[PDB]
Symmetry: D2
Subunit: 114 residues, 4 copies
């Protein structure tokens, strides 16, 4: 898969499990078309969101439901979610979106290889 | 002003100057209404976006135009922008500082919330 | 003061108060000499650690006692502290702001460097 | 291995390759005894630093030579290195030390499992 999502918990020092992630692609009318989604695994990872054929150039949004996660832990969060918006190519790779979560802070990083 | 935005450049170790910032509020429509906008100063800060009267309860989105910043420096960044979405003033008026730290392929955002 | 330390709590979204900060400078010995120390204020900031006269070229270490902070809150953190080591004033006098953002199992540190 | 190190480059969006990492254990006289070391792989990871038998409770320091990395890229860095100091146990796990590097900023996170 050319697109993977890895989420970590900076309060507990652990992968975030069962966190909902939605992926959108920007449409012609500049609205967000649902594209893919899932829930992070026990390793805090989400694989097999798309394929090389489906993942064409364009602008994508990755939305991590961080609020629901912190609610499950009984911790009051600041953000409604974590949103990463990026342009796939040019030109032509494997994308790993990493997210490090705290209740009042998050960081996201793109690891782009091949 | 109950809402302040501060941006830093993690590559140069300096405040980001002239960075565009757009604020939106979720209408009952469920659509995003333009709420306020501006650009960061020399200190990388943006003050006076709004007032205590105007800044009511709601869900707000703060879009920082990081792409324009990096490209002006000859850098092609990963992100289109840095976007912060949060519920404000749910338990009464607060003062919010939104801090962003920018790298070409990474950013972090932190909220500092105080009771005026 | 050419050296300022600022600390934030990423769990509460607030400045960290009464956080111990110890500064060291590498002697020709290659050992760390106690240079200065203090505690953060209500704003999570620590000013007046040193002066332009005293703050010469060298390698400096800034140890933030994050463990004590978290444990006071009933939290058992991963890190013993947050430690920043850097060469200062190599190309002339600069003003340094060391920013730390604290979570129980994670921290980030950023340097903001300006020419006075 | 009960201790792994993963390093990423936030400027290029890539794992950091060939970055020297040194591990120390605090001794009785409170000095840092060299314990293990190596260079990150093509995946920016460093495995097999120690074993379950060797990795006993105590205070450890992990030192990442970030300065040399940025020098190789021709980018002026702020820090001399990135240092993570922590106490292994109590009580009794797999430690992953993650580091996200920028020239004037770094973040480190502990992922502790099992």
């Amino acid at each position: 898969c050319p697109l993977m999502v890895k989420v970590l918990d900076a309060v507990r020092g652990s992968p975030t499990i069962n966190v909902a992630v939605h992926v959108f692609r920007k449409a012609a009318d500049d609205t967000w078309e649902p594209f893919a989604s899932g829930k992070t695994s026990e390793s805090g990872e989400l694989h097999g969101l798309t394929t090389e054929e489906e993942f064409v150039e364009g602008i994508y949004k990755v939305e991590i439901d961080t609020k629901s996660y912190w609610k499950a832990l009984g911790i009051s969060p600041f953000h409604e979610h974590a949103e990463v918006v990026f342009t796939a190519n040019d030109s032509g790779r494997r994308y790993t979106i990493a997210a490090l979560l705290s209740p009042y802070s998050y960081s996201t990083t793109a690891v782009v290889t091949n």
